[PDB]
Tab-separated table of C-alpha atoms in Angstrom:
chain	number	residue	atom	x	y	z
A	1	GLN	CA	-23.430	-5.190	18.222
A	2	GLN	CA	-25.869	-7.412	15.861
A	3	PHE	CA	-27.979	-10.496	15.468
A	4	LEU	CA	-25.360	-12.281	13.032
A	5	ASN	CA	-24.048	-14.620	15.851
A	6	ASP	CA	-27.452	-14.970	17.178
A	7	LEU	CA	-29.065	-15.082	13.442
A	8	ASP	CA	-26.399	-17.655	12.228
A	9	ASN	CA	-27.448	-19.799	15.574
A	10	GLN	CA	-31.161	-19.099	14.946
A	11	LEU	CA	-30.798	-20.355	11.214
A	12	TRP	CA	-28.324	-22.938	11.948
A	13	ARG	CA	-30.564	-24.528	14.335
A	14	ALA	CA	-33.367	-24.457	12.116
A	15	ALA	CA	-31.225	-26.000	9.422
A	16	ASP	CA	-30.040	-28.633	12.013
A	17	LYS	CA	-33.383	-29.846	12.661
A	18	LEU	CA	-33.992	-30.528	9.156
A	19	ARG	CA	-30.838	-32.547	8.507
A	20	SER	CA	-32.112	-35.901	8.601
A	21	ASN	CA	-30.007	-38.747	6.875
A	22	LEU	CA	-27.270	-36.387	5.304
A	23	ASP	CA	-23.511	-36.769	6.103
A	24	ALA	CA	-22.490	-33.077	7.002
A	25	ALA	CA	-20.166	-33.370	3.578
A	26	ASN	CA	-23.564	-33.857	1.519
A	27	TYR	CA	-25.952	-31.504	3.512
A	28	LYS	CA	-23.771	-28.494	3.326
A	29	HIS	CA	-24.058	-28.551	-0.527
A	30	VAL	CA	-28.097	-28.283	-0.108
A	31	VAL	CA	-27.879	-25.654	2.316
A	32	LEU	CA	-24.919	-23.678	0.939
A	33	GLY	CA	-26.041	-23.980	-2.587
A	34	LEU	CA	-29.557	-22.827	-1.217
A	35	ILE	CA	-27.794	-19.516	0.408
A	36	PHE	CA	-26.098	-18.955	-3.019
A	37	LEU	CA	-29.559	-19.078	-4.793
A	38	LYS	CA	-31.057	-16.382	-2.246
A	39	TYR	CA	-28.141	-14.243	-2.907
A	40	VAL	CA	-28.138	-14.107	-6.677
A	41	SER	CA	-31.976	-13.341	-6.414
A	42	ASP	CA	-32.052	-10.783	-3.947
A	43	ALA	CA	-29.087	-8.624	-5.647
A	44	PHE	CA	-30.836	-8.868	-9.001
A	45	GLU	CA	-34.364	-8.328	-7.792
A	46	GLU	CA	-32.831	-5.131	-6.024
A	47	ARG	CA	-31.088	-3.976	-9.166
A	48	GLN	CA	-34.442	-4.560	-10.949
A	49	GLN	CA	-35.656	-2.323	-8.401
A	50	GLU	CA	-33.292	0.329	-8.339
A	51	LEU	CA	-33.583	0.500	-11.982
A	52	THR	CA	-37.346	0.738	-11.807
A	53	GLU	CA	-36.751	4.128	-10.105
A	54	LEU	CA	-34.052	5.558	-12.344
A	55	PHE	CA	-36.055	4.908	-15.736
A	56	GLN	CA	-38.776	7.078	-14.067
A	57	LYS	CA	-36.820	9.747	-12.731
A	58	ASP	CA	-37.118	13.108	-14.559
A	59	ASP	CA	-33.758	14.888	-14.238
A	60	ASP	CA	-31.377	15.729	-17.218
A	61	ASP	CA	-28.178	14.671	-15.309
A	62	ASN	CA	-29.835	11.183	-15.111
A	63	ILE	CA	-28.991	8.862	-18.249
A	64	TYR	CA	-31.196	6.035	-17.371
A	65	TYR	CA	-34.373	8.049	-17.650
A	66	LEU	CA	-37.283	6.944	-19.999
A	67	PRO	CA	-39.539	9.895	-20.693
A	68	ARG	CA	-43.026	9.082	-20.201
A	69	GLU	CA	-43.802	12.116	-22.760
A	70	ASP	CA	-42.568	10.046	-25.284
A	71	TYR	CA	-45.242	7.499	-24.867
A	72	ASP	CA	-49.023	7.305	-25.592
A	73	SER	CA	-50.374	5.533	-22.639
A	74	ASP	CA	-49.352	4.197	-19.096
A	75	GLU	CA	-49.492	0.416	-20.199
A	76	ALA	CA	-47.143	1.310	-23.197
A	77	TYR	CA	-44.677	3.225	-20.887
A	78	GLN	CA	-44.549	0.095	-18.636
A	79	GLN	CA	-43.841	-2.114	-21.593
A	80	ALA	CA	-40.881	0.099	-22.741
A	81	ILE	CA	-39.739	-0.026	-18.969
A	82	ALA	CA	-40.035	-3.773	-18.967
A	83	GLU	CA	-38.005	-4.192	-22.157
A	84	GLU	CA	-35.417	-1.671	-20.756
A	85	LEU	CA	-35.170	-4.197	-17.911
A	86	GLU	CA	-34.240	-6.914	-20.371
A	87	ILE	CA	-30.935	-5.114	-21.128
A	88	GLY	CA	-28.039	-7.145	-19.968
A	89	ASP	CA	-25.489	-4.350	-19.844
A	90	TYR	CA	-27.255	-2.816	-16.529
A	91	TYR	CA	-26.543	-6.165	-14.806
A	92	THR	CA	-23.010	-6.879	-15.931
A	93	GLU	CA	-22.136	-2.968	-15.312
A	94	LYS	CA	-22.580	-3.525	-11.574
A	95	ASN	CA	-21.734	-7.197	-11.148
A	96	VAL	CA	-25.211	-8.578	-11.036
A	97	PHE	CA	-25.700	-11.882	-12.660
A	98	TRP	CA	-28.888	-12.666	-14.924
A	99	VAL	CA	-31.338	-14.730	-13.285
A	100	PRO	CA	-33.848	-16.167	-15.272
A	101	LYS	CA	-37.717	-16.272	-14.472
A	102	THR	CA	-37.248	-19.952	-13.427
A	103	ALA	CA	-34.509	-19.470	-11.180
A	104	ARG	CA	-35.693	-16.485	-9.197
A	105	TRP	CA	-36.000	-17.153	-5.463
A	106	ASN	CA	-39.378	-15.323	-5.005
A	107	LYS	CA	-40.868	-17.525	-7.727
A	108	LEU	CA	-39.638	-20.811	-6.061
A	109	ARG	CA	-41.282	-20.281	-2.741
A	110	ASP	CA	-44.663	-20.057	-4.032
A	111	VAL	CA	-44.369	-22.767	-6.456
A	112	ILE	CA	-45.840	-25.675	-4.314
A	113	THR	CA	-48.443	-26.928	-7.059
A	114	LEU	CA	-48.064	-30.664	-6.810
A	115	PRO	CA	-45.636	-33.079	-8.451
A	116	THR	CA	-46.673	-30.670	-11.464
A	117	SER	CA	-39.480	-33.114	-7.368
A	118	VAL	CA	-38.572	-29.926	-5.945
A	119	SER	CA	-34.850	-30.947	-6.038
A	120	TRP	CA	-35.508	-30.907	-9.783
A	121	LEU	CA	-36.566	-27.130	-9.547
A	122	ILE	CA	-33.502	-25.978	-7.576
A	123	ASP	CA	-31.014	-27.998	-9.998
A	124	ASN	CA	-32.755	-26.517	-13.042
A	125	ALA	CA	-32.711	-23.095	-11.552
A	126	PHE	CA	-28.617	-23.510	-11.301
A	127	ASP	CA	-28.543	-24.787	-14.810
A	128	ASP	CA	-31.023	-21.955	-15.988
A	129	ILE	CA	-28.601	-19.422	-14.196
A	130	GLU	CA	-25.525	-21.012	-15.616
A	131	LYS	CA	-26.134	-20.723	-19.450
A	132	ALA	CA	-27.375	-16.859	-18.700
A	133	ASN	CA	-23.826	-16.213	-17.163
A	134	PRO	CA	-21.050	-18.165	-18.769
A	135	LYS	CA	-18.531	-16.574	-15.924
A	136	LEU	CA	-20.289	-19.158	-13.628
A	137	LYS	CA	-19.906	-22.353	-15.785
A	138	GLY	CA	-19.634	-25.645	-13.700
A	139	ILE	CA	-19.672	-23.989	-10.338
A	140	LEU	CA	-23.128	-24.936	-8.929
A	141	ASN	CA	-23.121	-27.900	-6.789
A	142	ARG	CA	-26.226	-29.675	-8.217
A	143	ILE	CA	-28.152	-31.069	-5.130
A	144	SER	CA	-30.208	-34.101	-6.791
A	145	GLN	CA	-27.114	-36.358	-5.781
A	146	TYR	CA	-27.909	-35.753	-2.071
A	147	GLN	CA	-31.340	-37.320	-1.832
A	148	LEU	CA	-32.915	-35.404	0.753
A	149	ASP	CA	-36.668	-35.205	1.642
A	150	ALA	CA	-38.620	-32.715	-0.437
A	151	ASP	CA	-40.472	-31.236	2.658
A	152	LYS	CA	-37.207	-31.117	4.380
A	153	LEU	CA	-36.071	-29.048	1.350
A	154	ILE	CA	-39.108	-27.110	1.320
A	155	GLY	CA	-38.768	-26.398	4.862
A	156	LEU	CA	-35.213	-25.434	4.433
A	157	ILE	CA	-36.680	-22.961	1.680
A	158	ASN	CA	-39.037	-21.611	4.125
A	159	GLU	CA	-36.397	-20.973	6.813
A	160	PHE	CA	-34.327	-18.721	4.494
A	161	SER	CA	-37.076	-16.415	3.559
A	162	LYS	CA	-28.590	-8.049	1.314
A	163	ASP	CA	-25.588	-7.221	2.993
A	164	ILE	CA	-25.686	-10.133	5.113
A	165	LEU	CA	-25.557	-13.321	3.453
A	166	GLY	CA	-21.766	-13.212	2.991
A	167	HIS	CA	-21.422	-13.519	6.560
A	168	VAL	CA	-24.417	-16.009	6.715
A	169	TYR	CA	-22.474	-18.270	4.152
A	170	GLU	CA	-19.150	-18.339	5.594
A	171	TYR	CA	-20.363	-19.272	9.070
A	172	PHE	CA	-22.191	-22.600	7.651
A	173	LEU	CA	-19.275	-23.099	5.677
A	174	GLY	CA	-17.222	-22.990	8.950
A	175	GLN	CA	-19.754	-25.157	10.724
A	176	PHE	CA	-20.039	-27.676	8.325
A	177	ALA	CA	-16.334	-27.865	8.377
A	178	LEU	CA	-16.431	-28.417	12.382
A	179	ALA	CA	-19.133	-30.926	11.961
A	180	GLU	CA	-17.698	-32.942	8.910
A	181	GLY	CA	-14.381	-33.909	11.097
A	182	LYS	CA	-12.522	-32.666	8.015
A	183	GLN	CA	-9.414	-30.693	8.841
A	184	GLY	CA	-6.768	-28.654	7.148
A	185	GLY	CA	-6.851	-25.304	5.217
A	186	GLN	CA	-8.234	-27.063	2.192
A	187	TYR	CA	-11.333	-27.552	4.253
A	188	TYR	CA	-11.541	-24.420	6.368
A	189	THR	CA	-9.057	-22.080	8.018
A	190	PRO	CA	-10.861	-20.075	10.968
A	191	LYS	CA	-11.414	-16.351	10.887
A	192	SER	CA	-8.504	-15.624	13.636
A	193	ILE	CA	-5.452	-17.174	11.624
A	194	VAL	CA	-6.931	-15.919	8.281
A	195	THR	CA	-7.270	-12.307	9.743
A	196	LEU	CA	-3.820	-12.392	11.527
A	197	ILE	CA	-1.784	-13.548	8.396
A	198	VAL	CA	-3.810	-11.053	6.204
A	199	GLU	CA	-3.326	-8.413	8.607
A	200	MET	CA	0.352	-8.956	8.894
A	201	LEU	CA	0.488	-8.981	5.124
A	202	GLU	CA	-1.159	-5.950	3.989
A	203	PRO	CA	-2.533	-6.860	0.753
A	204	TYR	CA	-3.233	-3.086	-0.360
A	205	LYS	CA	-2.489	-3.408	-4.173
A	206	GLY	CA	-1.527	-5.839	-6.467
A	207	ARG	CA	-1.880	-9.608	-7.517
A	208	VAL	CA	-3.094	-11.643	-4.573
A	209	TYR	CA	-2.521	-15.439	-4.751
A	210	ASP	CA	-3.229	-18.565	-2.764
A	211	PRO	CA	-1.976	-21.744	-4.374
A	212	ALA	CA	-4.112	-24.090	-2.177
A	213	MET	CA	-7.081	-21.994	-1.441
A	214	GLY	CA	-9.635	-24.162	-0.062
A	215	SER	CA	-13.263	-22.233	0.274
A	216	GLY	CA	-11.037	-19.006	-0.553
A	217	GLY	CA	-11.208	-17.750	3.148
A	218	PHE	CA	-8.109	-15.601	2.437
A	219	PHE	CA	-9.760	-13.779	-0.269
A	220	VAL	CA	-12.730	-12.918	1.607
A	221	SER	CA	-10.282	-11.938	4.337
A	222	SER	CA	-8.274	-9.912	1.813
A	223	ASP	CA	-11.481	-8.096	0.603
A	224	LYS	CA	-12.659	-6.918	3.958
A	225	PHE	CA	-9.264	-6.093	5.126
A	226	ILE	CA	-9.448	-3.154	2.349
A	227	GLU	CA	-12.879	-2.336	3.767
A	228	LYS	CA	-11.986	-1.828	7.278
A	229	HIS	CA	-8.729	0.078	6.608
A	230	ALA	CA	-10.463	2.604	4.281
A	231	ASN	CA	-11.156	5.292	6.484
A	232	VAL	CA	-7.984	5.664	8.575
A	233	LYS	CA	-6.183	5.260	5.015
A	234	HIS	CA	-8.803	7.847	3.385
A	235	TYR	CA	-9.426	5.968	0.126
A	236	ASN	CA	-12.488	4.744	-1.447
A	237	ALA	CA	-12.939	0.938	-0.479
A	238	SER	CA	-15.036	0.118	-3.328
A	239	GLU	CA	-12.192	1.503	-5.827
A	240	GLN	CA	-9.319	0.365	-3.674
A	241	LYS	CA	-10.580	-3.554	-4.304
A	242	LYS	CA	-9.818	-2.440	-8.136
A	243	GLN	CA	-6.033	-2.463	-7.181
A	244	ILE	CA	-6.174	-6.176	-6.243
A	245	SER	CA	-6.580	-9.151	-8.623
A	246	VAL	CA	-7.294	-12.563	-7.220
A	247	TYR	CA	-5.516	-15.934	-8.218
A	248	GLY	CA	-5.829	-19.026	-6.733
A	249	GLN	CA	-5.785	-22.826	-6.906
A	250	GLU	CA	-7.489	-25.862	-5.643
A	251	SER	CA	-7.434	-29.496	-6.396
A	252	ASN	CA	-10.701	-30.492	-4.601
A	253	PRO	CA	-13.628	-30.394	-7.369
A	254	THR	CA	-16.496	-29.506	-4.881
A	255	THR	CA	-14.005	-27.144	-2.602
A	256	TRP	CA	-13.253	-25.146	-5.995
A	257	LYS	CA	-17.184	-24.650	-6.582
A	258	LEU	CA	-17.488	-23.668	-2.891
A	259	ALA	CA	-14.827	-21.034	-3.401
A	260	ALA	CA	-16.308	-20.048	-6.643
A	261	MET	CA	-19.576	-19.598	-4.995
A	262	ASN	CA	-18.046	-17.551	-1.979
A	263	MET	CA	-16.226	-14.944	-4.470
A	264	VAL	CA	-19.623	-14.471	-6.125
A	265	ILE	CA	-21.436	-13.589	-2.899
A	266	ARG	CA	-18.597	-11.459	-1.833
A	267	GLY	CA	-18.746	-9.631	-5.424
A	268	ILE	CA	-14.867	-10.465	-5.808
A	269	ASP	CA	-13.432	-10.922	-9.305
A	270	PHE	CA	-11.710	-14.143	-9.394
A	271	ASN	CA	-9.356	-16.264	-11.379
A	272	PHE	CA	-9.091	-19.844	-9.977
A	273	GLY	CA	-7.555	-21.407	-13.286
A	274	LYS	CA	-9.298	-23.439	-15.884
A	275	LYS	CA	-10.409	-26.008	-13.353
A	276	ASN	CA	-9.656	-27.583	-10.013
A	277	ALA	CA	-6.218	-29.152	-10.426
A	278	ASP	CA	-3.104	-30.106	-8.414
A	279	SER	CA	-0.547	-27.290	-8.173
A	280	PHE	CA	2.450	-29.405	-8.494
A	281	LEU	CA	1.322	-31.342	-11.506
A	282	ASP	CA	-0.796	-28.893	-13.209
A	283	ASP	CA	0.138	-25.214	-12.065
A	284	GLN	CA	-2.697	-23.062	-13.158
A	285	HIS	CA	-0.854	-20.005	-13.083
A	286	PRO	CA	2.786	-20.988	-14.614
A	287	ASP	CA	3.671	-17.407	-14.870
A	288	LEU	CA	2.035	-15.597	-12.205
A	289	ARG	CA	4.463	-13.428	-10.130
A	290	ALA	CA	2.271	-12.330	-7.250
A	291	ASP	CA	2.730	-9.454	-4.822
A	292	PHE	CA	1.149	-11.293	-1.859
A	293	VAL	CA	1.173	-14.984	-1.575
A	294	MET	CA	-0.904	-16.505	1.458
A	295	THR	CA	-1.795	-19.912	2.093
A	296	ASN	CA	-3.074	-22.759	4.759
A	297	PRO	CA	-2.365	-25.890	2.763
A	298	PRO	CA	-2.682	-29.736	4.022
A	299	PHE	CA	-0.016	-30.048	6.635
A	300	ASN	CA	2.372	-33.236	6.290
A	301	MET	CA	1.072	-33.996	2.862
A	302	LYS	CA	2.329	-37.455	1.871
A	303	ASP	CA	1.608	-38.915	-1.824
A	304	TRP	CA	2.437	-35.753	-3.619
A	305	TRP	CA	5.619	-36.591	-5.356
A	306	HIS	CA	5.835	-38.230	-8.700
A	307	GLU	CA	9.031	-38.716	-11.002
A	308	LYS	CA	8.206	-36.116	-13.272
A	309	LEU	CA	8.871	-33.322	-10.389
A	310	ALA	CA	12.455	-33.918	-10.078
A	311	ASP	CA	14.546	-30.983	-11.485
A	312	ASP	CA	11.355	-28.679	-11.552
A	313	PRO	CA	12.452	-25.169	-11.155
A	314	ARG	CA	10.510	-24.701	-7.771
A	315	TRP	CA	13.094	-26.535	-6.098
A	316	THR	CA	15.849	-24.136	-7.104
A	317	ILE	CA	16.247	-20.820	-4.957
A	318	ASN	CA	17.260	-17.550	-7.058
A	319	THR	CA	18.825	-15.175	-4.900
A	320	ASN	CA	21.502	-12.612	-5.747
A	321	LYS	CA	21.052	-19.983	-8.178
A	322	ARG	CA	20.697	-22.685	-5.194
A	323	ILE	CA	19.246	-26.200	-5.895
A	324	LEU	CA	17.396	-27.922	-3.176
A	325	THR	CA	16.622	-31.655	-2.837
A	326	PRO	CA	12.780	-31.261	-2.222
A	327	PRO	CA	10.877	-32.959	0.714
A	328	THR	CA	9.456	-35.999	-0.972
A	329	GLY	CA	7.560	-37.314	2.315
A	330	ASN	CA	6.183	-34.098	3.206
A	331	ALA	CA	4.783	-31.283	1.179
A	332	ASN	CA	5.288	-28.651	3.726
A	333	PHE	CA	8.403	-27.111	2.309
A	334	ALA	CA	7.406	-27.911	-1.288
A	335	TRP	CA	4.328	-25.661	-0.959
A	336	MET	CA	6.632	-22.761	0.531
A	337	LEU	CA	9.014	-23.235	-2.492
A	338	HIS	CA	6.211	-23.011	-4.788
A	339	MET	CA	4.827	-19.899	-3.181
A	340	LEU	CA	8.387	-18.393	-3.490
A	341	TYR	CA	9.124	-19.306	-7.293
A	342	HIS	CA	5.718	-17.363	-7.653
A	343	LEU	CA	6.748	-14.560	-5.698
A	344	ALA	CA	7.594	-11.258	-7.171
A	345	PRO	CA	10.793	-9.658	-6.543
A	346	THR	CA	9.150	-7.128	-4.262
A	347	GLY	CA	6.689	-9.825	-2.637
A	348	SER	CA	5.683	-10.863	0.617
A	349	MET	CA	4.668	-14.277	1.556
A	350	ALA	CA	2.883	-15.778	4.719
A	351	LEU	CA	2.019	-19.436	5.577
A	352	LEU	CA	0.595	-21.458	8.201
A	353	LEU	CA	2.422	-24.869	9.083
A	354	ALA	CA	3.012	-27.451	11.894
A	355	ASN	CA	5.635	-26.716	14.482
A	356	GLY	CA	7.826	-29.547	13.279
A	357	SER	CA	8.399	-27.143	10.326
A	358	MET	CA	10.497	-25.058	12.581
A	359	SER	CA	12.740	-27.593	14.140
A	360	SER	CA	12.451	-30.968	12.398
A	361	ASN	CA	15.575	-32.264	10.443
A	362	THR	CA	13.305	-35.043	8.724
A	363	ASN	CA	12.364	-34.536	5.123
A	364	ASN	CA	15.542	-32.350	4.145
A	365	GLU	CA	13.989	-29.704	6.272
A	366	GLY	CA	17.428	-28.589	8.296
A	367	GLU	CA	19.167	-28.092	4.840
A	368	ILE	CA	16.045	-26.218	3.456
A	369	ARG	CA	15.485	-24.327	6.602
A	370	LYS	CA	19.419	-23.645	6.428
A	371	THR	CA	19.186	-22.279	2.875
A	372	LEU	CA	16.140	-20.019	3.075
A	373	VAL	CA	17.655	-18.175	6.086
A	374	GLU	CA	21.253	-18.079	4.799
A	375	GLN	CA	19.564	-16.376	1.908
A	376	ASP	CA	17.689	-13.680	3.859
A	377	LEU	CA	14.112	-14.842	2.531
A	378	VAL	CA	12.656	-15.573	6.038
A	379	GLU	CA	11.606	-12.378	7.315
A	380	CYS	CA	9.239	-13.304	10.744
A	381	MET	CA	8.592	-16.273	12.381
A	382	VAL	CA	5.344	-16.721	14.666
A	383	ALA	CA	4.599	-19.475	17.323
A	384	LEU	CA	0.775	-19.860	17.635
A	385	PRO	CA	-0.735	-21.062	20.998
A	386	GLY	CA	-0.773	-24.999	20.799
A	387	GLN	CA	-4.430	-24.628	21.878
A	388	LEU	CA	-5.378	-22.230	19.209
A	389	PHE	CA	-8.547	-22.678	16.986
A	390	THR	CA	-6.807	-23.686	13.879
A	391	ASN	CA	-8.746	-26.623	12.549
A	392	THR	CA	-5.829	-28.283	12.234
A	393	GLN	CA	-5.222	-31.503	14.450
A	394	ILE	CA	-1.316	-30.476	14.482
A	395	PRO	CA	-0.174	-27.216	16.172
A	396	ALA	CA	0.759	-24.421	13.893
A	397	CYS	CA	2.957	-21.462	13.391
A	398	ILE	CA	3.490	-18.886	10.481
A	399	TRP	CA	6.220	-18.337	8.316
A	400	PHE	CA	6.801	-15.108	6.910
A	401	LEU	CA	9.152	-14.499	3.858
A	402	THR	CA	10.152	-11.445	1.433
A	403	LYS	CA	12.105	-11.149	-1.567
A	404	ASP	CA	12.844	-7.565	-1.070
A	405	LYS	CA	13.840	-6.659	2.492
A	406	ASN	CA	15.298	-3.352	1.337
A	407	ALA	CA	14.482	0.109	2.683
A	408	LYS	CA	11.417	1.360	0.881
A	409	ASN	CA	8.001	2.621	0.950
A	410	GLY	CA	8.327	3.383	4.799
A	411	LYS	CA	10.248	0.361	5.490
A	412	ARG	CA	14.143	0.235	6.409
A	413	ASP	CA	17.043	-1.955	4.940
A	414	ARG	CA	16.602	-4.902	7.334
A	415	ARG	CA	18.886	-7.655	5.392
A	416	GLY	CA	20.205	-10.533	7.520
A	417	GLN	CA	17.334	-9.633	10.126
A	418	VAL	CA	14.614	-12.000	11.343
A	419	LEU	CA	11.794	-11.069	13.639
A	420	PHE	CA	10.751	-13.629	16.160
A	421	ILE	CA	7.609	-13.597	17.945
A	422	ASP	CA	5.911	-15.908	20.612
A	423	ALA	CA	2.133	-15.562	20.459
A	424	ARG	CA	1.847	-18.888	22.746
A	425	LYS	CA	0.050	-16.938	25.627
A	426	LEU	CA	-2.252	-14.385	23.469
A	427	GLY	CA	-5.858	-15.009	23.065
A	428	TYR	CA	-9.099	-15.874	24.880
A	429	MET	CA	-10.593	-19.416	25.956
A	430	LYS	CA	-12.930	-20.048	23.003
A	431	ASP	CA	-14.303	-23.328	24.802
A	432	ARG	CA	-12.724	-25.188	27.558
A	433	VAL	CA	-9.568	-25.815	25.487
A	434	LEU	CA	-9.624	-24.012	22.376
A	435	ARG	CA	-8.078	-20.362	22.109
A	436	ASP	CA	-8.925	-17.679	19.513
A	437	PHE	CA	-7.754	-14.004	19.100
A	438	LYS	CA	-9.750	-11.104	18.929
A	439	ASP	CA	-8.776	-7.920	16.843
A	440	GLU	CA	-6.750	-6.899	19.647
A	441	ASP	CA	-4.681	-9.936	19.897
A	442	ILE	CA	-4.283	-9.723	15.875
A	443	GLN	CA	-3.589	-5.881	16.269
A	444	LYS	CA	-0.924	-6.346	18.805
A	445	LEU	CA	0.973	-8.901	16.266
A	446	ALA	CA	-0.028	-6.876	13.044
A	447	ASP	CA	1.508	-3.519	14.917
A	448	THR	CA	4.625	-5.307	16.768
A	449	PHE	CA	6.096	-6.863	13.239
A	450	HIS	CA	5.546	-3.908	10.933
A	451	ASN	CA	7.422	-1.593	13.456
A	452	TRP	CA	10.478	-4.002	13.257
A	453	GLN	CA	10.165	-3.399	9.416
A	454	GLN	CA	10.132	0.389	10.520
A	455	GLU	CA	12.796	0.835	13.408
A	456	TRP	CA	14.145	-1.584	15.727
A	457	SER	CA	16.865	-1.967	18.381
A	458	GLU	CA	17.768	-4.350	21.371
A	459	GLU	CA	15.296	-2.116	23.479
A	460	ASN	CA	12.420	-3.074	21.571
A	461	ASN	CA	12.931	-6.629	22.154
A	462	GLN	CA	10.153	-7.880	24.629
A	463	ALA	CA	10.913	-10.830	26.961
A	464	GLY	CA	8.939	-13.872	26.454
A	465	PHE	CA	7.324	-12.309	23.419
A	466	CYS	CA	9.598	-10.871	20.752
A	467	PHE	CA	13.427	-10.641	19.509
A	468	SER	CA	15.358	-9.657	16.661
A	469	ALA	CA	18.093	-11.949	15.126
A	470	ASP	CA	20.631	-11.883	12.440
A	471	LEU	CA	22.407	-14.552	10.285
A	472	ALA	CA	24.774	-14.937	12.890
A	473	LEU	CA	22.520	-16.156	16.155
A	474	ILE	CA	20.534	-18.388	14.138
A	475	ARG	CA	23.504	-20.279	12.686
A	476	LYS	CA	24.406	-20.799	16.512
A	477	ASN	CA	20.910	-22.037	17.150
A	478	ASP	CA	21.714	-24.243	13.935
A	479	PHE	CA	18.844	-22.890	11.560
A	480	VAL	CA	16.188	-23.881	14.060
A	481	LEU	CA	13.638	-21.050	14.023
A	482	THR	CA	11.626	-21.735	17.000
A	483	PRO	CA	10.650	-18.461	18.618
A	484	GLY	CA	10.940	-20.123	22.287
A	485	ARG	CA	14.861	-20.562	21.440
A	486	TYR	CA	15.227	-16.663	21.139
A	487	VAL	CA	13.462	-15.143	24.245
A	488	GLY	CA	11.793	-15.881	27.584
């Protein structure tokens, strides 16, 4: 297809040759913040452009039109145009943010002058951009802190000189994830897994929630999912995205800004709460009951429990009240439970976790894994290749849960039932050891699991790959939910 992979690489290498002393953790903020700054301009300078034509278009069905005949000179017509531009409504109406004189990219490349730092300029631009668009307050990672050499910054600005930057932002974000040696869904979830979960979830309409979002990869994924299914579905993708509202939370201060920066580039409306904050200690969405819940939280989280959490409603399952002792030495099930509590009665949730999840008895996980099942909340379990490109140092699996296993909207009454799949062999060798999925692998798994929702009997089982269990057989397998048990 395209240059994007090549273009990632061409900008990436040029951005590497300029990385000097900076720890990835700090450099990324210079690069990504810079990318953001090019986006906001382009979109704006493009919207100024497209308005420069609509004012001048002589057509009655056009409402933007400034009649030249109403004026007495060219220059006097230009002045009216220029003032009409200064009407903020035209930028908010298509989701363009006001970029002041100062912040504008095209202006900054040329401002070489002399000392009269260039780092001052960017930072000041961000500043200038923020006061102009309250919706964007706090979000811009300032880059004075990270004390890079001006000529590297200059050279950086030269190297970046509309549809694309989204891809060209999430690559860097991914690649700065790798090169920082910072692992976990709070830092980065690769496209594969995030496209799988989303594809299995099918977030068409409703409130979408991630309670530990990281850079918000799932929300990008969610948004794209709508786009690529538009045709076959025969809706208008632009209008379909209005049927989803985005809720999220993330406790890491800079990651929260990385996420908000990402949603803007993707032109996605977002609620990420008042501020970055712990989900357990300060749930930002205390009354959200979301339709889709999707997350890749930090695995085996220690240090998360506090006395003030005992007798949190989140530890009490409510299915047609069960009170669970929460796993104080590992947040894995706490997350799930938090997600569940925030799950509509018609909802579907999916999360990535460590395989231990499926068979460990530590941390009150046997009891919890028993109750979740006994109550028919678990809908599907996937095992993922240990080798899989997962950004996790500990190998992973997906849990899928519903509150509503009833026969509805295409799907059949599958109460008591659980679809196990083993994806251990699927995918291709990313490097010497890693594995990744192409959308064909994804597709299989998407398509398999939906069908089990739509029609399934012992014939559809597929030795080594999938199997359908009910409450009974899992009670014999002692609530161990590892797909390996159930087929081969």
